[PDB]
Amino acid sequence: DLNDYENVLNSLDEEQIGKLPQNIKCVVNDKLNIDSEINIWDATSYYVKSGKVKAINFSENKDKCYDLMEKLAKAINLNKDVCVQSHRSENGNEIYLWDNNYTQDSIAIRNDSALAETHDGKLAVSASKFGTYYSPFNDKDKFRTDKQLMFMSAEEAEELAVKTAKELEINVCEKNELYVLDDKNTLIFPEDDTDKQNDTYVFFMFPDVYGIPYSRCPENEALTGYANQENHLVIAMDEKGISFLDIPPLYDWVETTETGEILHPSSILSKEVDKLKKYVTSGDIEVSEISLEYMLFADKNETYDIKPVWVVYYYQNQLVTGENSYTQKMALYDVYDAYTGEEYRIQ
Numbered sequence: 391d392l393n394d395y396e397n398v399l400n401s402l403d404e405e406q407i408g409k410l411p412q413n414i415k416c417v418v419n420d421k422l423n424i425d426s427e428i429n430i431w432d433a434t435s436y437y438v439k440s441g442k443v444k445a446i447n448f449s450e451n452k453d454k455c456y457d458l459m460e461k462l463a464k465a466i467n468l469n470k471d472v473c474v475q476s477h478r479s480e481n482g483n484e485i486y487l488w489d490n491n492y493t494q495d496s497i498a499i500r501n502d503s504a505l506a507e508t509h510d511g512k513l514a515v516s517a518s519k520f521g522t523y524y525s526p527f528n529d530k531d532k533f534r535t536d537k538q539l540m541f542m543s544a545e546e547a548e549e550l551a552v553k554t555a556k557e558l559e560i561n562v563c564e565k566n567e568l569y570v571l572d573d574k575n576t577l578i579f580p581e582d583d584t585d586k587q588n589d590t591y592v593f594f595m596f597p598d599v600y601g602i603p604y605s606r607c608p609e610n611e612a613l614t615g616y617a618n619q620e621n622h623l624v625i626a627m628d629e630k631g632i633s634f635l636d637i638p639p640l641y642d643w644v645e646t647t648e649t650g651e652i653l654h655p656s657s658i659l660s661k662e663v664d665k666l667k668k669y670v671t672s673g674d675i676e677v678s679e680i681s682l683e684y685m686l687f688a689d690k691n692e693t694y695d696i697k698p699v700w701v702v703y704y705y706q707n708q709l710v711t712g713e714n715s716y717t718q719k720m721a722l723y724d725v726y727d728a729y730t731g732e733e734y735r736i737q
């Protein structure tokens with residue numbers, strides 16, 4: 391049976407990474423279920439490099455900054471003639487802004503982030519029910535549907551997102567995630583009485599190197615050494631075109647430090663199930679994703695060590711404080727060194 395736990399483990403022990411399944415489903419026991427995506431992205435084998443990377447500073451070189459600004463302005467169709475530029479320096483970081491005060495379109499570029507948005511895009515992605523953070527509930531998951539909006543197909547929308555990442559010169563995995571922000575995306579914080587829900591597609595693309603995306607884990611400064619964030623390039627579009635473009639921190643590969651064979655995900659899942667069985671008293675669990683990612687660890691002088699990890703994303707149905715039986719589905723995760731299987735402490 392395709393849904394037996396031992397058969398699922400065996401299916402995750404493929405000698406060729408490209409032959410692993412993309413989804414697995416099985417019951418472990420009456421308090422632990424697996425209904426999970428398997429993500430090995432564009433990895434070509436289990437032999438993976440570790441290395442050193444340098445942070446890409448988007449704003450330190452004014453020429454490079456303005457070059458990024460023009461690509462973002464093309465994407466959101468910003469009227470550059472009527473825009474007002476502003477600039478600030480904060481703790482050695484340069485911040486550049488371009489605002490169209492008539493339309494409320496804006497571009498903001500800092501050392502490790504860039505955001506271009508229309509007024510409608512801003513409200514769809516950041517003033518409504520949709521949220522981009524995995525923690526604490528993975529609210530985005532309810533918008534990951536096959537609905538086709540009426541202004542363009544999901545296939546045509548994906549072609550525009552792929553073309554935009556190429557224009558921005560950001561290498562991303564072939565797999566992206568699509569969120570459909572239709573009427574279910576309730577507008578919570580309108581700015582004016584004229585603001586309404588606007589049908590929008592939101593793609594998450596994943597900047598990568600050697601076919602493996604940088605970590606999609608929540609911030610965990612104890613583990614990474616810095617205020618890390620989820621690696622997703624967010625591209626949204628409505629009937630007017632691209633409406634929101636958020637670029638996460640990017641990195642430039644400097645050198646390979648070591649290369650080795652990583653564990654098959656069977657080894658990770660069996661170890662993670664053994665761990666999760668011990669946390670049974672804290673609530674029922676459902677494993678939702680096993681993913682091969684590159685984690686960054688702060689080193690020195692804007693350099694980071696880049697090493698492969700296996701991330702297990704799961705939900706736990708936890709009792710709400712002060713409640714006798716009311717529970718909340720919490721989005722949690724575990725991280726393993728992909729070479730050794732060392733489990734990292736996630737507090």
Ligand code: NA
Nearest residue numbers: 572573587589
């Ligand atoms: Na609608």
